[PDB]
Amino acid sequence: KFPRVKNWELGSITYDTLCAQSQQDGPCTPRRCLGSLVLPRKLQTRPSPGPPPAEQLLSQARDFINQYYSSIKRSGSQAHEERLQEVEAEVASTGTYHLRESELVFGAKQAWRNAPRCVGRIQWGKLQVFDARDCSSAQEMFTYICNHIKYATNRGNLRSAITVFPQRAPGRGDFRIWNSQLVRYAGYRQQDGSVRGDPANVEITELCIQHGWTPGNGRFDVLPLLLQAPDEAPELFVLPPELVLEVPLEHPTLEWFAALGLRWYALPAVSNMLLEIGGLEFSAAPFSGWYMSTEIGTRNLCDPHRYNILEDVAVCMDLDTRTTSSLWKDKAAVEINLAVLHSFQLAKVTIVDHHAATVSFMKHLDNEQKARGGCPADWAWIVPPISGSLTPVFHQEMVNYILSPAFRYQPDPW
Amino acid sequence: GPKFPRVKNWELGSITYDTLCAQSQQDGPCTPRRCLGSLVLPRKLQTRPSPGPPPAEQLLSQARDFINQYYSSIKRSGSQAHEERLQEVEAEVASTGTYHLRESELVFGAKQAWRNAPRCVGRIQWGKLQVFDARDCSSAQEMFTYICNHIKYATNRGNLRSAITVFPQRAPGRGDFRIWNSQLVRYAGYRQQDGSVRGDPANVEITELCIQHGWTPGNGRFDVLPLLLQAPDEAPELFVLPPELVLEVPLEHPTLEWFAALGLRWYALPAVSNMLLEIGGLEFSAAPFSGWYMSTEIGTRNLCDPHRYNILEDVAVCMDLDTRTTSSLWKDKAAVEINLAVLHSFQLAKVTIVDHHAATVSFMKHLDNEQKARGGCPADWAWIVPPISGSLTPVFHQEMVNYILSPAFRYQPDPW
Ligand code: HEM
Ligand code: HEM
Ligand SMILES: C[C@H](O)[C@H](O)[C@H]1CNc2nc(N)[nH]c(=O)c2N1
Ligand SMILES: C[C@H](O)[C@H](O)[C@H]1CNc2nc(N)[nH]c(=O)c2N1
Ligand SMILES: [Zn+2]
Numbered sequence: 001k002f003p004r005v006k007n008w009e010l011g012s013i014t015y016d017t018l019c020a021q022s023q024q025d026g027p028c029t030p031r032r033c034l035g036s037l038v039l040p041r042k043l044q045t046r047p048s049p050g051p052p053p054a055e056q057l058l059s060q061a062r063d064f065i066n067q068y069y070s071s072i073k074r075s076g077s078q079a080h081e082e083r084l085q086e087v088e089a090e091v092a093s094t095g096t097y098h099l100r101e102s103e104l105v106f107g108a109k110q111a112w113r114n115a116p117r118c119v120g121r122i123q124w125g126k127l128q129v130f131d132a133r134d135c136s137s138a139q140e141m142f143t144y145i146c147n148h149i150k151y152a153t154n155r156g157n158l159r160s161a162i163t164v165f166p167q168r169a170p171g172r173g174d175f176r177i178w179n180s181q182l183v184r185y186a187g188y189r190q191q192d193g194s195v196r197g198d199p200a201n202v203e204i205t206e207l208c209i210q211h212g213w214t215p216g217n218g219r220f221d222v223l224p225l226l227l228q229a230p231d232e233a234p235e236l237f238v239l240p241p242e243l244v245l246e247v248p249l250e251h252p253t254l255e256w257f258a259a260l261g262l263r264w265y266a267l268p269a270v271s272n273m274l275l276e277i278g279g280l281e282f283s284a285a286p287f288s289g290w291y292m293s294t295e296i297g298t299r300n301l302c303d304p305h306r307y308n309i310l311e312d313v314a315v316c317m318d319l320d321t322r323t324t325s326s327l328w329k330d331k332a333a334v335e336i337n338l339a340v341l342h343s344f345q346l347a348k349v350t351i352v353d354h355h356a357a358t359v360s361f362m363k364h365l366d367n368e369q370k371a372r373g374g375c376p377a378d379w380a381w382i383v384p385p386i387s388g389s390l391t392p393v394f395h396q397e398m399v400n401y402i403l404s405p406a407f408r409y410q411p412d413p414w
Numbered sequence: 415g416p417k418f419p420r421v422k423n424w425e426l427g428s429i430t431y432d433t434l435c436a437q438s439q440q441d442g443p444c445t446p447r448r449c450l451g452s453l454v455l456p457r458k459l460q461t462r463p464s465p466g467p468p469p470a471e472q473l474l475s476q477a478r479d480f481i482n483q484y485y486s487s488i489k490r491s492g493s494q495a496h497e498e499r500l501q502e503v504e505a506e507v508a509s510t511g512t513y514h515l516r517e518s519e520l521v522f523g524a525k526q527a528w529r530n531a532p533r534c535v536g537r538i539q540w541g542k543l544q545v546f547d548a549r550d551c552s553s554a555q556e557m558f559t560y561i562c563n564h565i566k567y568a569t570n571r572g573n574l575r576s577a578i579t580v581f582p583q584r585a586p587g588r589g590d591f592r593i594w595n596s597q598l599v600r601y602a603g604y605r606q607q608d609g610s611v612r613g614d615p616a617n618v619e620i621t622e623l624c625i626q627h628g629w630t631p632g633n634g635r636f637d638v639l640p641l642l643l644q645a646p647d648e649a650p651e652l653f654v655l656p657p658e659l660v661l662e663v664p665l666e667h668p669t670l671e672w673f674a675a676l677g678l679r680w681y682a683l684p685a686v687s688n689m690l691l692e693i694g695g696l697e698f699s700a701a702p703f704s705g706w707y708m709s710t711e712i713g714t715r716n717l718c719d720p721h722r723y724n725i726l727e728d729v730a731v732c733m734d735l736d737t738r739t740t741s742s743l744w745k746d747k748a749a750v751e752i753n754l755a756v757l758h759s760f761q762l763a764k765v766t767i768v769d770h771h772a773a774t775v776s777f778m779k780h781l782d783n784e785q786k787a788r789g790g791c792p793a794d795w796a797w798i799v800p801p802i803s804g805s806l807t808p809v810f811h812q813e814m815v816n817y818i819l820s821p822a823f824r825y826q827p828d829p830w
Contacts, residue, residue, distance in 0.1 A: 003450055009720045019448045028444035028451070032435040032817035034419055035444070035451035036795035041420075298805055305425050310806070324771035325757050327750060330803045334746045341741050355740035379452035379796055385805035389714055390726070390745045394801070401448035 005374075009395035016399040018374030023063075024402035035400060036380055043402070045274050045281065045410040051095035051170040057279040060404070061087050061097060064278030067110070068103050095170065099280060105129045107277030108162050111405035112287070117381040119357055119393075120289055122364035128152075128161040135165050138227040138235035141175065145225065145286065146243060149182060152288045153245050153267055158350035162287035167280045169230075174283035176413045178226035178234055179204055182269035182286055183244055186221040197221060199305055207414065211236050219307075220246075220263055228413060247347045251339040256316055262309070264296045264340070266349045274410040283410060290350040292357045297337030298385040309336070333386055354384035358391040365396070376401045425811035432815040434790030439479065440818040451816060452796055459818060461690045461697065461826040467511050467586045473695040477503050477513060480694025480821070483526065484519050503694075511586055515696060521545045523693035524578050527821035528703070533797040535773050535809070536705055538780035544568075544577035551581050554643040554651040557591065561598060561641065561702065562659060568704050569661050569683050574766035578703035582646075583696045589646030591700040592829045595620055595639065598685035598702055599660060602637040613637065615721055623830065627652050636662075636679055644829060663763045667755045672732060678725065680712045680756070682765045690826040699826060706766040708773045713753035714801040725752065749802055770800035774807035781812065792817045 002015045027034040069080040090097035113124040132144040148163040165175040187195050187202040197219050209215050213224050213236055222244055228234035245266045251257030269288035274281055301307045310332050314321050319328035344351040368375035377398035388394045418431045443456035450456045485496040506513040529540040548560045564579045581591040603611050603618035613635050625631050629640050629652055638660050644650040661682040667673035685704035690697055717723045726748050730737050735744035760767035784791035793814035804810045
């Protein structure tokens with residue numbers, strides 16, 4: 001009924017009862033596990049041209065409202081009862097409803113808390129929520145986004161934040177941020193199909209150019225934003241350079257590293273995910289925290305389909321790249337992650353290494369075990385891309401399931 | 415489009431569909447409600463002791479399926495020999511309650527079980543396996559002889575060869591043939607007065623069991639344990655492996671001259687001996703198998719795990735790294751050198767070994783072959799991706815579908 005969860009490094013055991021509260025299905029079935037897959041299809045977020053089944057929506061709505069009032073120890077209170085009646089009344093007459101800022105703030109934090117793929121959830125209680133539901137144009141979205149960036153960056157002392165734009169409305173286009181992150185380096189298709197810059201951003205780089213952007217020719221050219229207001233062609237907005245803080249990468253001992261001319265931005269702001277609270281959907285709700293060094297040092301800079309700088313640093317380190325057994329790849333990767341941590345600390349910009357991060361996640365697991373009886377976690381995503389078993393999370397079994405509020409993936413707007 | 419799991423490789427952007435999972439006849443631990451893919455032993459395959467004979471109905475179904483697999487493998491499906499072999503199995507189960515496998519069927523099943531192992535990254539070698547038939551074995555002493563021959567052939571003085579030795583299958587209300595040790599080669603785990611452990615903490619229980627059975631314990635950090643072999647309805651008998659048969663490799667580093675002074679070492683042969691081999695319903699409770707190590711098994715897990723030898727801090731102190739702060743990545747640096755030491759030492763000793771890069775690259779090739787041969791390959795991502803440099807290897811970027819196929823190697827409860 002309830003899964004027995006074990007930590008093999010300590011011998012400790014727990015039972016996940018929280019999973020019982022999951023009302024949404026994942027990709028697995030008793031015949032086969034699909035937990036290693038990145039995207040669903042069944043868990044996506046289909047169009048919104050028609051009103052969501054009043055029965056469905058109301059159910060999800062009552063549940064969330066119930067959650068909210070429990071959180072403020074006012075369950076069964078007068079306000080609780082009248083709030084439910086309001087939601088019922090609004091849905092019944094308009095086929096939808098709206099949240100109060102306080103409830104929105106609660107929903108946003110809960111969505112983060114329920115994010116199975118986030119290793120930094122111990123910070124889930126400290127989140128600055130910018131209500132931008134009073135947005136009616138792409139130009140306004142841009143101002144909000146510029147303020148979110150200014151606040152979150154805080155001159156290098158990053159602070160977690162999220163900005164929530166208008167909810168989806170039946171038969172009306174969605175407010176969407178086309179870029180996957182608020183800060184993305186351009187990826188220019190050159191010569192023989194090769195790519196200058198960030199291969200991951202080739203498509204978005206092309207769309208920008210198509211919408212009037214004057215491309216550059218560097219490896220780290222900050223892309224413009226394509227903000228889109230309902231049923232309107234997206235608009236191009238250039239981010240003020242002074243707002244986009246970047247960190248030049250150098251190595252604590254390897255003098256030549258700096259020569260490589262590598263750099264990375266300080267603000268990790270996902271902007272293509274959908275935020276669902278009480279059945280309501282927010283197609284544009286950009287959120288940001290601070291980077292865990294492996295995201296940059298290992299995935300972004302070392303992935304074969306990303307910057308793929310592994311061989312370069314290896315050759316500079318004069319490593320034997322003739323064979324796998326020399327572990328030249330493992331050696332350069334460690335120096336690159338070291339360089340990221342070194343540089344960020346030198347620039348006085350918030351960042352967390354994978355050891356510190358996973359240790360804090362273990363504490364979070366414990367806090368949640370006592371607080372909710374479990375904690376949805378995606379093992380494949382929580383374990384760092386390098387030095388896996390060298391971290392506590394590797395030796396920790398985890399249960400994965402869908403709780404709401406939740407951050408979900410949604411189709412690309414184009 | 416296709417009504418099967420869509421699998422993607424994010425490095426290459428290639429897509430495949432796994433249709434082989436449709437052949438899975440056994441349910442795993444996940445449900446649409448929650449994924450338990452990260453649990454080491456969810457209560458699923460777990461071949462718990464089912465004494466009283468199995469439902470002739472259930473066994474027959476499993477047996478017919480296996481026989482079909484066999485005749486298909488030889489390309490004689492639907493033939494007269496196929497139908498006659500099917501009749502024979504049914505007749506045998508009808509009169510005895512069980513049945514027996516022909517020689518070539520056992521070889522086929524042994525390999526299919528390896529081929530079907532979701533947690534094995536070395537499956538590209540699945541076709542090359544030496545199958546020692548030991549279904550005639552009638553004593554714990556004879557079990558020891560068989561095992562010794564296995565080790566000799568498998569070790570082959572450094573040039574390791576994969577092999578499995580199959581002892582008598584489980585029989586109606588009779589005792590099982592069991593090897594108590596999890597592996598043919600295990601280092602003792604001595605519990606100290608202060609509560610710590612000298613040697614390998616993973617083997618504390620088996621060590622205390624050998625002692626309780628008359629073994630005179632040593633006090634080293636790497637004392638090779640004796641084997642506790644158990645023939646049907648008999649108490650386990652203790653057997654000490656002839657030192658000359660247990661090939662070991664002293665560990666040294668290619669450039670850090672002091673590493674050898676650590677006196678670390680590991681045995682060359684990885685022989686899992688506590689798993690149950692299941693074929694067409696028949697259960698071989700004792701069927702030790704061995705291949706060759708992937709360097710991370712030794713260098714990352716066995717030597718650096720917190721609950722194993724835990725030598726990370728000692729090696730870092732020796733490398734004079736700042737072990738007072740996580741951001742120095744002293745754990746990462748020490749781990750890389752320790753792993754290099756294992757690859758270096760094994761190569762020096764001319765003992766077969768494969769790094770996590772070469773191994774994963776070959777598994778990707780294996781996935782390609784299997785997509786073509788069977789339309790899929792059951793794989794456990796958490797176990798396929800190496801314990802270090804995960805995303806530096808190709809498997810990290812390959813989505814995988816996990817499911818249970820038989821023949822199979824399953825976990826089984828400890829005999830004690
Ligand atoms: C406070 C610092 C934070 C750190 C260090 C952190 C770290 C991480 C890491 C390492 C990942 C995986 C990134 C990847 O591999 O692409 C991630 C994913 C995620 N985080 Fe956090 N996180 C933090 C804050 C936040 C905040 C503020 C939110 C939301 C309000 C959040 C929501 C998520 C979600 C939904 C995912 C999955 C995104 C996806 O599927 O692409 N995180 N986080
Ligand atoms: C030729 C060399 C081989 C290599 C490099 C290889 C490598 C591996 C690795 C890395 C593991 C994981 C070990 C762990 O984390 O505990 C493993 C597991 C496994 N391998 Fe292979 N393998 C090979 C040969 C074999 C053979 C010959 C068989 C059987 C006939 C086999 C059956 C399995 C099974 C059942 C598991 C899972 C065992 C468990 O759950 O602990 N392997 N193998
Ligand atoms: C195929 C596999 O699911 C994929 O490569 C996953 C693995 N783990 C991950 N973990 C994190 N944090 N981020 C990722 O993008 C991934 N990618
Ligand atoms: C909890 C988690 O499932 C566990 O630590 C797994 C992860 N991956 C593994 N992978 C391999 N090859 N071997 C193991 O023992 C494990 N342990
Ligand atoms: Zn699953």
